[model samples]
Target: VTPPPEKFNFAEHLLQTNRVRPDKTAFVDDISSLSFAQLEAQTRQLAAALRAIGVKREERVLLLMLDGTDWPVAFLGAIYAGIVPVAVNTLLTADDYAYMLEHSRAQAVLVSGALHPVLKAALTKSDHEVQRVIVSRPAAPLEPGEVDFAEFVGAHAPLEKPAATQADDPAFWLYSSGSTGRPKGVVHTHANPYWTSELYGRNTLHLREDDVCFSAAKLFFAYGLGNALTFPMTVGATTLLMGERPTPDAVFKRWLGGVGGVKPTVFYGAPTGYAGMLAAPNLPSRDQVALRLASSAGEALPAEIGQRFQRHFGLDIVDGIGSTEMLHIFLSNLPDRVRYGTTGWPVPGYQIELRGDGGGPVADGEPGDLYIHGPSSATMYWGNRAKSRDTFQGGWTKSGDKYVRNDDGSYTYAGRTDDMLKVSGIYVSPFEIEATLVQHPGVLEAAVVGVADEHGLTKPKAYVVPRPGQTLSETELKTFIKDRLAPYKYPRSTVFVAELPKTATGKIQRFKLREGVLG
Candidate 1:
């Protein structure tokens, strides 16, 4: 039987931290840093204002700001005020934002000045009756109903009374990347962050207050929230949040900066982020900064990319598999127990199984659909009851991805079940082929998909990004794969491009390849 979840109040954590370590640094970005004390005070003041504005318990508020100090203040403050804060990805198109606002029925929005134009355009399409609080350049002129973030918070007194909330109360929502279809809202209870931080972070990553953390994945993502916000905040560590696109140069500039910046101890990135780092110019040495641990998730970390990252940085990356529904990492590689290709063992608090068709268990080495059950797993997909029932039933999350469990207990990623390439009636994981192709000296990146043939059959196709100055020699690549892989597994056609189309969260949109959306 499960014990009752701790009396969690999301704001209470920082408020308690402020009492214990008031002077410790809490958050830092390129623009400014906020101490624990200041963050607690500012969060309370903001919470007081949001409550004073008649924000009620369980009401939805959209946080559509870019990464900054005020982002957290607004997010946590809303939660403290008993308002459910839904964070939006900044890289979204105007239509996407409008869709989110309309679907969420948000009562208010907290946005940055840089994002004001997009918000304005989205609002024109949105009929949600949402109030907008423009942060950052709040001094700028506002529209009819728009108000300044600074003034809004200043008008209300500081919030001293915490709203009555239980551990199971709905706290937040994170929208799925919607790679295969429309984005779905994954609602997480207030207990999720605490549970994930205890098991996936503190027990697994061993985060400490002295650790300076950095994540190339932005905070709007589940992986990013765990890496940058929950993990560091739980242990009183300092997190560096950057609003810039997580490209090679921008990421490394923060990672390698030696003067007047917090040296990163834990570096979090996705496989694509690491791939870009490999292709970056004037790459810094390992000793240039104080990085100790590196983690890769959000998508599968190809073995080739993992080895290359380790070869370049002298730090082994803990490649793992996590999802928006599961909150954070459920199966991950641990420090000192690294596996080159597998996604390591199951996290302590979670139970995972691999199942074949008809819910039967797969053979020891066979690939099957992954099903995960855990304390932190999300139970619903807001407004999508049918999908929620299909994916989340009996506390088990049908991961919708294929995976093979080794006899030694490590789990290897087979691409998403939907993305799996079926050729000659045999299902193959595209990640396997892409991982092999990326090992080539001239290949910068690769994505594999199955394209339909004239006979209504399907064959594997490869789309590759070659090194900046070199074009891929198809004959060499064909021969390279022909030498090592099975005859049926090699991609029949190869297309080269400057870069592959990716989602806002850095995941490749495999459906686009099937539609011939790329050259």
Candidate 2:
């Protein structure tokens, strides 16, 4: 793949690519549909509006809005004007957004009216002063510092020309959560999204102009940003955007063509989402939806979940593993050829390595830390050089994930390198134990963590959530894992819970479980 031109704006590049299809629908969201022409007009209008409000080029603005037709405009508009939009998770608490407001030092905040209450609290809670608060689809009349989103765009004429930005210039920011401490700001360049879209979205997934995309992951996530915005816009395909949660019913609605009177041909989701839909009683039949293919990320897809999904839809869930630091999937299962359990080979432009603690490549079948060497890697964590150095080593990015390379040339997830357990001098993967427990018929979900025994030695402890209306015995659960895995891998203690605590993206908070043990 050729590199992007030295002077390029991602948003401008997309606009130019789709200029010929000006009347084509670019996006269909909960509120309205945006034609390619409208998208370009509104995006440039937003760029001019931000400048009119004194948000100069290269400054940061907080994007606190929900997913909708307004979202892409907010993000792309910032890039078009050479301003960086710090896109944040909408589900976070006021305190979280408060820190972000201060950390990103946002000149302004573009938030959904429905989420204004939290932003109001966040603004009051932080010492940072913002110039403006633009509200989208407001629930009530605006206040002194607030402006209506529609009025904001309509108040200004579209900018005549895009900012002359370099491909390596900072485009936007996405916060990457740590197991502990405040989230680190992962900064991506204008060319980062270009590389991901070219190598993965277009070259790998083969998305086309006729396809309609929908992602269960929201736009704030790196995965969702690619799935819902960059990829679709690059191909001039229409995208379905959801402003609410991606519950089973909500997703089913889009699949059955309930929203926007159109069905999604390419659906992107997480493993937890796939499991829930398979478990839902009202799952749409194969004939009911128009899904040609599906994609999974955010977490490793278990074989059972993918198998069940394929059995029902007669469609495969192309599983992949990616991180915020890398921007999108560097390693993934191919669309036509998929091994149910393993994340397939690296994308053509990416190189993957599994290295032992000694920093040397590990032999196949040996568990090792995963590292990716790719062009789409984020440049740095904002203002955190120490962490930036630790994660991005010259041309390579160290993924915190651990994996084992199979003889078939596929990589199977072991666990998070930080989340691994050392029990009696043997390294045990919490993911392996958790995966085994979740395979049981009675289990809905499970999380495994290392807990100290009475003698102060570490042992595996499992937290299992049983399927609704199903009863499970602790003895049977322990025996169930032992039968599947080695006897030593069984959890020494068992706790039956209604549900496991998880991040918004459906990753289990194993640290929370570990905290419960210590506290």
Candidate 3:
């Protein structure tokens, strides 16, 4: 049974669980496995270490650690010590990292040894107020000034438990892809993850203590935080942490060996990862290991990929949509009730309503803006109150996604409302058309945009990136779409590109591609 929704605190809950399940495995990285007892003891030691360095409640501490064993220990230790850890993406450019560091006004920065040079360069470029820079792994030698994370934390006097923070107090920050502009920090609270975990446990995934969860998404993102850390620890389930990019071959090797070693029961990743895995040759049989659940998020999973994956893995993939601003997924199909094309019903305690531009709810089966209200929603964007207010108007957080709600409460995702285009007086959803086009075996990826023709009328054009070793002529591609789609929806012109531009989170940068074609 699921726990009732109440004002919950993560630090308290974690410690309580540790007392009961101390001997059980809490986390297993490639190199080591730590039990709940070890995790609790180390977390307490790290908390003391943090407090000794003047870290205090509600102070925003920047975490630049990679996804590994140290990441969770540092993250939970920060919470225990009354500091909120804001994880930054390691792949971001120096300028992007500098902007976030300056905007958040972080008091301290904790980074891995591998990222020290990057952090140093970013810090040198910006005039931000970062007092201490703590390195996670031991380095060759500090470039004369950096503090060692192990020495500093190990030397400090152990501290007792800190005072409790309110449920609504700011807990952490995650940045959006910023495809439209500069990335904005989305601030979430202790309440956000607690409620999200409850919803995950109740509606989407029921994790058992023996289950091991793996997420290909990095720990810096909200989806990874919910799936990789919070959900597993909330239920005393074990989590496998990997500190590397999730390529198909690398992930397959990890799963085949790691699951054979640790026996993970649940697997979570983006749609792209699953598609890549499906493309991999000679994947092991599911009977060889105990993988019972597969989930995809971050983007819509193509129905064909989902079907193919199930055939190969002997399990269905549950695709759900979520955003950094929303904290985690609030709508998902239960494992047993998997629906192929639709993102499933709303999770418990959350309401999903499709609203027209005029603020009225749209009728079922009509595409409109997605508005969501739930406890897991972030209260604001850090240092951007105006944008925050604009997004969270009318007590429902505007998801900026175009969606259609069916009579059965299932939702079909149309493209982003901002990405929708009107061509020849007809609305065109790029995602739906793109999904349809990719169903063809020759096409690897597709991007659709509206371009103004010589007659000053907007027309739909598709940019196709063909699969390797597959040849497709422009005439053939155009006719292929014409035969598959309605005459009005068919692309008037098609451009074969090497690759479509994508955001950091793998969403197609349609506006940029549109600009390129228009220019």
Winner by lDDT: 2
Per-model TM against the reference: 0.81, 0.83, 0.80
Question: lDDT per prediction?
Answer: 0.80, 0.88, 0.76
Reference-based TM-score, model 1: 0.81
Q: Clashes per prediction? A: 0, 0, 0
Candidate 2's displacement at residue 231, Å, is: 0.5
lDDT value, candidate 3, whole model: 0.76
Give lDDT for model 2. Answer: 0.88
Q: Which residue pairs in model 1 clash with each other? A: none
The reply for model 3, stretches above 4 Å from the true place, is: 1-8, 420-519
Cα RMSD of all models vs. native, in order, equals: 10.2, 9.8, 10.0
In candidate 3, the residue pairs with backbone N, CA or C atoms under 3 Å apart (3 or more residues apart, or in different chains) clash, namely none
What lDDT, from 0 to 1, does candidate 1 have? 0.80
Best by TM-score: 2
Q: For residues 29-55, what per-residue lDDT tens digits would candidate 2 score against the true structure? A: 876999999999999999999999999
Model 3: ten consecutive residues of lowest lDDT: 420-429
* Best of the two (1, 2) by lDDT: 2
Candidate 1 stretches with Cα past 4 Å from truth are 1-6, 138-140, 177-181, 258-260, 420-519
Looking at candidate 2, the ten consecutive residues that score lowest on lDDT are 419-428
